[PDB]
Design an enzyme around this catalytic site. Structure first.
Site, PDB file in Angstrom:
ATOM      1  N   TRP A   5      26.445  27.824 -16.680  1.00 41.96           N
ATOM      2  CA  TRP A   5      26.552  27.225 -15.466  1.00 41.96           C
ATOM      3  C   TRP A   5      27.061  27.919 -14.291  1.00 41.96           C
ATOM      4  CZ3 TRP A   5      26.706  22.094 -18.465  1.00 41.96           C
ATOM      5  CH2 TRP A   5      25.294  21.707 -18.740  1.00 41.96           C
ATOM      6  N   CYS A  40      18.157  16.958 -23.316  1.00 38.46           N
ATOM      7  CA  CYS A  40      17.584  15.828 -22.534  1.00 38.46           C
ATOM      8  C   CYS A  40      18.733  14.567 -22.756  1.00 38.46           C
ATOM      9  CB  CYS A  40      16.265  15.447 -22.795  1.00 38.46           C
ATOM     10  SG  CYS A  40      15.034  16.734 -21.970  1.00 38.46           S
ATOM     11  N   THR A  85      13.152  35.027 -15.079  1.00 39.17           N
ATOM     12  CA  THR A  85      12.511  34.163 -14.173  1.00 39.17           C
ATOM     13  C   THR A  85      13.216  34.108 -12.717  1.00 39.17           C
ATOM     14  OG1 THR A  85      13.664  32.515 -15.122  1.00 39.17           O
ATOM     15  CG2 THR A  85      11.618  32.820 -15.905  1.00 39.17           C
ATOM     16  N   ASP A 129      25.913  27.914  -9.087  1.00 37.67           N
ATOM     17  CA  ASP A 129      24.425  27.629  -9.732  1.00 37.67           C
ATOM     18  C   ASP A 129      23.657  27.431  -8.275  1.00 37.67           C
ATOM     19  OD1 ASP A 129      23.410  26.487 -12.786  1.00 37.67           O
ATOM     20  OD2 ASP A 129      22.005  27.032 -11.178  1.00 37.67           O
ATOM     21  N   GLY A 176      11.863  29.270 -17.230  1.00 35.85           N
ATOM     22  CA  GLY A 176      11.381  29.083 -18.432  1.00 35.85           C
ATOM     23  C   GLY A 176      12.062  29.934 -19.276  1.00 35.85           C
ATOM     24  N   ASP A 199      23.460  34.269 -20.031  1.00 29.81           N
ATOM     25  CA  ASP A 199      22.895  33.365 -19.199  1.00 29.81           C
ATOM     26  C   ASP A 199      23.446  33.468 -17.731  1.00 29.81           C
ATOM     27  OD1 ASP A 199      22.225  30.146 -18.674  1.00 29.81           O
ATOM     28  OD2 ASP A 199      20.719  31.422 -19.013  1.00 29.81           O
TER      29      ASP A 199
HETATM   30  C1  HEC Z   1      13.351  16.030 -22.428  1.00 29.58           C
HETATM   31  C2  HEC Z   1      12.288  16.888 -22.170  1.00 29.58           C
HETATM   32  C3  HEC Z   1      13.413  15.221 -23.629  1.00 29.58           C
HETATM   33  C4  HEC Z   1      13.637  15.560 -24.903  1.00 29.58           C
HETATM   34  C5  HEC Z   1      13.797  17.099 -25.257  1.00 29.58           C
HETATM   35  C6  HEC Z   1      13.787  14.525 -25.711  1.00 29.58           C
HETATM   36  N1  HEC Z   1      13.460  13.568 -25.112  1.00 29.58           N
HETATM   37 FE1  HEC Z   1      13.567  11.598 -25.913  1.00 29.58          FE
HETATM   38  N2  HEC Z   1      13.266  10.816 -23.854  1.00 29.58           N
HETATM   39  C7  HEC Z   1      12.824  11.524 -22.816  1.00 29.58           C
HETATM   40  C8  HEC Z   1      12.647  10.603 -21.511  1.00 29.58           C
HETATM   41  C9  HEC Z   1      12.600  11.177 -20.263  1.00 29.58           C
HETATM   42  C10 HEC Z   1      12.877   9.542 -22.369  1.00 29.58           C
HETATM   43  C11 HEC Z   1      12.582   8.026 -21.378  1.00 29.58           C
HETATM   44  C12 HEC Z   1      12.353   7.866 -19.817  1.00 29.58           C
HETATM   45  C13 HEC Z   1      12.290   6.685 -19.222  1.00 29.58           C
HETATM   46  O1  HEC Z   1      12.685   6.086 -18.484  1.00 29.58           O
HETATM   47  O2  HEC Z   1      11.450   5.942 -20.095  1.00 29.58           O
HETATM   48  C14 HEC Z   1      13.007   9.600 -23.650  1.00 29.58           C
HETATM   49  C15 HEC Z   1      13.093   8.473 -24.489  1.00 29.58           C
HETATM   50  C16 HEC Z   1      13.573   8.337 -25.749  1.00 29.58           C
HETATM   51  C17 HEC Z   1      13.410   7.478 -26.842  1.00 29.58           C
HETATM   52  C18 HEC Z   1      13.459   5.954 -26.148  1.00 29.58           C
HETATM   53  C19 HEC Z   1      14.725   5.421 -25.524  1.00 29.58           C
HETATM   54  C20 HEC Z   1      14.558   4.023 -25.046  1.00 29.58           C
HETATM   55  O3  HEC Z   1      13.673   3.564 -24.609  1.00 29.58           O
HETATM   56  O4  HEC Z   1      15.687   3.407 -25.176  1.00 29.58           O
HETATM   57  C21 HEC Z   1      13.786   7.983 -27.850  1.00 29.58           C
HETATM   58  C22 HEC Z   1      14.040   7.106 -29.174  1.00 29.58           C
HETATM   59  C23 HEC Z   1      14.018   9.292 -27.764  1.00 29.58           C
HETATM   60  N3  HEC Z   1      13.623   9.552 -26.433  1.00 29.58           N
HETATM   61  C24 HEC Z   1      14.111  10.052 -28.777  1.00 29.58           C
HETATM   62  C25 HEC Z   1      14.051  11.592 -28.715  1.00 29.58           C
HETATM   63  C26 HEC Z   1      14.466  12.404 -29.785  1.00 29.58           C
HETATM   64  C27 HEC Z   1      14.920  11.895 -31.383  1.00 29.58           C
HETATM   65  C28 HEC Z   1      14.463  13.685 -29.483  1.00 29.58           C
HETATM   66  C29 HEC Z   1      14.724  15.041 -30.346  1.00 29.58           C
HETATM   67  C30 HEC Z   1      13.527  15.220 -31.090  1.00 29.58           C
HETATM   68  C31 HEC Z   1      14.175  13.530 -28.139  1.00 29.58           C
HETATM   69  N4  HEC Z   1      14.061  12.290 -27.643  1.00 29.58           N
HETATM   70  C32 HEC Z   1      14.109  14.809 -27.104  1.00 29.58           C
HETATM   71  C33 HEC Z   1      12.956  12.937 -22.520  1.00 29.58           C
HETATM   72  C34 HEC Z   1      13.412  13.718 -23.842  1.00 29.58           C
HETATM   73  O1  LIG Z   2      16.088  30.221 -16.940  1.00 30.81           O
HETATM   74  C1  LIG Z   2      15.262  29.900 -16.230  1.00 30.81           C
HETATM   75  O2  LIG Z   2      13.882  30.118 -15.900  1.00 30.81           O
HETATM   76  C2  LIG Z   2      16.027  28.441 -15.704  1.00 30.81           C
HETATM   77  C3  LIG Z   2      15.039  27.828 -14.795  1.00 30.81           C
HETATM   78  C4  LIG Z   2      15.796  26.505 -14.459  1.00 30.81           C
HETATM   79  C5  LIG Z   2      14.903  25.536 -13.420  1.00 30.81           C
HETATM   80  O3  LIG Z   2      13.897  25.683 -13.248  1.00 30.81           O
HETATM   81  O4  LIG Z   2      15.485  24.420 -13.132  1.00 30.81           O
HETATM   82  C6  LIG Z   2      17.342  26.631 -14.288  1.00 30.81           C
HETATM   83  C7  LIG Z   2      18.043  27.591 -15.141  1.00 30.81           C
HETATM   84  N1  LIG Z   2      17.056  28.504 -15.717  1.00 30.81           N
HETATM   85  C8  LIG Z   2      19.486  27.660 -15.267  1.00 30.81           C
HETATM   86  O5  LIG Z   2      19.874  28.852 -16.017  1.00 30.81           O
HETATM   87  C9  LIG Z   2      20.403  26.831 -14.782  1.00 30.81           C
HETATM   88  O6  LIG Z   2      21.392  26.837 -15.009  1.00 30.81           O
HETATM   89  C10 LIG Z   2      19.727  25.480 -14.147  1.00 30.81           C
HETATM   90  C11 LIG Z   2      20.281  24.366 -13.582  1.00 30.81           C
HETATM   91  C12 LIG Z   2      19.257  23.809 -12.870  1.00 30.81           C
HETATM   92  C13 LIG Z   2      19.275  22.350 -12.345  1.00 30.81           C
HETATM   93  O7  LIG Z   2      18.314  21.867 -11.700  1.00 30.81           O
HETATM   94  O8  LIG Z   2      20.494  21.674 -12.267  1.00 30.81           O
HETATM   95  N2  LIG Z   2      18.306  24.518 -13.248  1.00 30.81           N
HETATM   96  C14 LIG Z   2      18.322  25.386 -13.833  1.00 30.81           C
HETATM   97 CA   LIG Z   3      18.626  30.128 -17.358  1.00 35.84          CA
END
Ligand code: HEC
Ligand SMILES: O=C(O)c1cc(C(=O)O)c2c(n1)C(=O)C(=O)c1cc(C(=O)O)[nH]c1-2
Ligand SMILES: [Ca+2]
Length: 684
Positions: free
Chosen positions: A386, A609, A235, A390, A176, A300
């Protein structure tokens, strides 16, 4: 038959009497990850073949090191789901899904991963993503106990690493530091889950008197109190090592939060125990010694990386040491009893330091190239976030004296923000306190940048402080290693295969496709005198989620499954279905100002993500390939409609207009994709 997973201190300590078992994440407390087994060797490994496989439930990062005890394998998949499989044929015994709270899925910086479980007196221990530490009956598959390790529910604390069990105590940290939290390590009773002790890695409110020798020492190295709200960092989200004779638990402490030292600690102080190796009494948790790899960490640079305990000839005398190759790029050989730095050498180019000062054991800072908080430039630094290495485990082979490291050669920009960042209440957004990871938006630029990144297996000689041999990989995040008495080192690659090299020369002897990238460390065991070797495959983790574009250089799709091999194996490898066609984007918007506004939001809330500049690594959804139906429900999705799938709700952070701004940006990026598309084809 004896109770399943009936492991205790003496059984682990005497692991060599049971080479057919792998009873601790690193097999042994010294975590050498060296198997005495040799049925498979550099003489016949070429006859190796898939014996059985098991498909995991979610196709996301798979980082688990399997645990094998008396015929049963205990491994994990995304979101900490625990699996118990018959180690002989892969039959599913039981499945325990802790049901990690998806509402908090966005609190995980680097994909919903889990590096494995630990065992003890008939129980399986798993660190759940949402921060819980749970015990599981090895026989029934039912929960025994559960504790919420989070010291503050308001902070984005998660657990991704594997716990270790020492003297009847389950040791676990948390992740975290990318969101802003105060690091710490807790020890819970293996039987009741009753908290035994807790060691914080960085000071808290400086107004209050320091608690414990560790903190009395650390408190002096921090200035101001702005880090209290930031969290401090440190962490211990991964590696741990243990020496029974000295009864010392070795803790790997992570990076500082925020990253920028000027905003975090007035650009003063070493900020202990950030980026340090810390030894404490396994039973009390009290401080004994420490070694800081990166004083005043500003890039980092964690030190949570794999630590190996071994004995080596140093200066003509046998020394009981601790070895580690943290993110900063140095390989350290340290006296695991006193913390004395015996040696330090770069295994990769380092722009942040002008080298080690062996008189003090402290690295000299290269301000002009890395002190982005003092200079005025946006420094391109290497290693970057990274590191040179790592989480992927390394291993030690006593028959060669070499340490096999899954190394990285990567770099990124670190730019200082002039105004002191203000903490944000939203728990699912990075809060680094600086600007990093900036890269081209266009496909040409991305490809060009990716060519500057590469990976490599390094067979390092800790005594000579030299690489015995090296093997290159097209990209980073290749798998952890495994050494055996058969003159072999096993490793999975990011580009999609499982490999076996001659431990002494590095000659490739065996190789098979893995259907996906292999990041987890490989494991080897035996059943009925027959040796098996298993890899946990599943592209994912931080690399292919955050730096989606660059990671495309791997040319693999996600597909999480357990892959285990043995001599003669003829089972067939299951592979992922082709990526679907990308639907055509909706009409582009003429509101550039809106597009621009959306781009800035996306960078701060979705990149970790869905990928920098909306280019996904293909593990998580690519927002530029949304079907017309998804576009219709874009607001409902952004506001919690997809939480059950790990897609956090942004109802608490965005206004509807803001959501539409992001949408317009994504649609615009979708058109850019169209313009390109061929440039993309040449990534793999
Ligand atoms: C990781 C914690 C995420 C962040 C940050 C954001 N999203 Fe996301 N999004 C995530 C997942 C795991 C999934 C779907 C997984 C599955 O298999 O169902 C999604 C999906 C979306 C979608 C729908 C896509 C589709 O069904 O084709 C949208 C439109 C979307 N996410 C938008 C979105 C936006 C605008 C974000 C920033 C504010 C955002 N996501 C962040 C995981 C994560
Ligand atoms: O700052 C943190 O607490 C934290 C947590 C984690 C995690 O829990 O996976 C990663 C990292 N840092 C990080 O710096 C990093 O490069 C990383 C790679 C990954 C992965 O799963 O490949 N986890 C993490
Ligand atoms: Ca880190």
């Amino acid at each position: 038959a004896d109770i399943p997973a009936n492991v205790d201190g003496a059984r682990i300590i005497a692991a060599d009497k049971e080479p057919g078992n792998w009873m601790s994440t690193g097999r042994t407390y010294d975590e050498q990850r060296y198997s005495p087994l040799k049925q498979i060797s550099d003489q016949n490994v070429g006859q190796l073949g898939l014996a059985w496989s098991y498909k995991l439930d979610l196709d996301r990062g798979v980082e688990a090191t399997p645990i094998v005890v008396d015929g049963v394998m205990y491994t994990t998949g995304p979101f900490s789901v625990v699996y118990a499989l018959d180690a002989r044929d892969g039959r599913l015994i039981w499945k325990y899904d802790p049901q990690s709270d998806r509402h908090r899925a966005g609190e995980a910086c680097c994909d919903a991963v889990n590096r494995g479980v630990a065992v003890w007196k008939g129980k399986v221990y798993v660190g759940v993503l949402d921060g819980r530490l749970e015990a599981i009956d090895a026989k029934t598959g039912q929960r025994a106990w559960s504790v919420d390790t989070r010291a503050d529910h308001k902070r984005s604390y998660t657990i991704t690493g594997a716990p270790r069990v020492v003297n009847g105590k389950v040791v676990i940290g948390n992740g975290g530091a990318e969101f802003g939290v105060r690091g710490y390590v807790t020890a819970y009773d293996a039987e009741t889950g009753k908290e035994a002790w807790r060691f914080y890695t960085v000071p808290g409110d400086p107004k209050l008197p320091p608690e414990g020798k560790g903190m009395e020492i650390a408190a002096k190295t921090w200035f101001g109190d702005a880090y209290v709200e930031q969290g401090g960092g440190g962490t211990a989200w991964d590696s741990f090592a243990y020496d029974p004779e000295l009864n010392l638990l070795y803790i790997g402490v992570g990076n500082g939060s925020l990253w920028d030292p000027k905003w975090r600690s007035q650009a003063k102080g070493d900020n202990l125990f950030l980026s340090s190796i810390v030894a404490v009494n396994a039973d009390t948790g009290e401080y004994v010694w420490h070694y800081q790899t990166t004083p005043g960490d500003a890039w980092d640079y964690t030190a949570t990386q794999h630590m190996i305990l071994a004995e080596l000839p140093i200066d003509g005398k046998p020394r009981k040491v601790l070895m580690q190759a943290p993110k900063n790029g140095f390989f350290y050989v340290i006296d695991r009893a006193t913390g004395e730095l015996l040696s330090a050498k770069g295994i990769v180019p380092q722009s942040w330091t002008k080298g080690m000062d062996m008189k003090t054991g402290r690295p000299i800072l290269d301000e002009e190239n890395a002190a982005y908080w003092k200079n005025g430039k946006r420094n391109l630094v290497t290693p970057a976030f990274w590191g040179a290495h790592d989480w992927q485990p390394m291993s030690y082979n006593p028959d060669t004296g070499l340490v096999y490291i899954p190394a990285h050669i990567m770099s990124a920009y670190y730019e200082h923000i002039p105004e002191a960042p203000k903490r944000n209440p939203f728990k699912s957004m990075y809060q680094l306190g600086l600007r990093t990871g900036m890269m081209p938006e266009g496909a040409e630029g991305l490809l060009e940048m990716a060519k500057s990144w590469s990976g490599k297996l390094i067979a390092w000689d800790p005594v000579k402080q030299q690489a015995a041999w090296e093997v290159p990989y097209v990209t980073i995040f290749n798998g952890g290693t495994l050494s055996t008495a058969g003159n072999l080192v096993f490793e999975g690659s990011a580009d999609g295969r499982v490999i076996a090299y001659a431990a002494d020369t590095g000659e490739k002897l065996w190789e098979q496709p893995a259907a996906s990238g292999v990041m987890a460390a490989p494991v080897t065991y035996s059943v009925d005198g027959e040796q098996y070797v298993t890899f946990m495959a599943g592209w994912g983790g931080a690399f292919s989620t955050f730096a989606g574009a660059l990671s495309l250089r791997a040319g693999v799709q996600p597909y999480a499954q357990v892959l285990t091999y043995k001599l003669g194996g003829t089972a067939k490898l299951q592979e992922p279905a082709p990526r679907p066609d990308t639907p055509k984007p909706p009409a582009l918007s003429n509101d550039t100002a809106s597009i621009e506004a959306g781009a800035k939001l996306y960078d701060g809330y979705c990149s970790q993500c869905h990928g920098i500049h909306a280019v996904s690594g293909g593990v998580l959804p690519d927002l530029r390939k949304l079907t017309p139906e998804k576009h219709q429900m874009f607001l409902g999705i952004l506001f919690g409609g997809r939480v059950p799938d790990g897609m956090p709700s942004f109802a608490d952070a965005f206004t509807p207009e803001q959501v539409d701004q992001i949408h317009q940006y994504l649609i615009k990026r979708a058109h850019d994709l169209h313009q390109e598309g061929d440039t993309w084809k040449q990534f793999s």
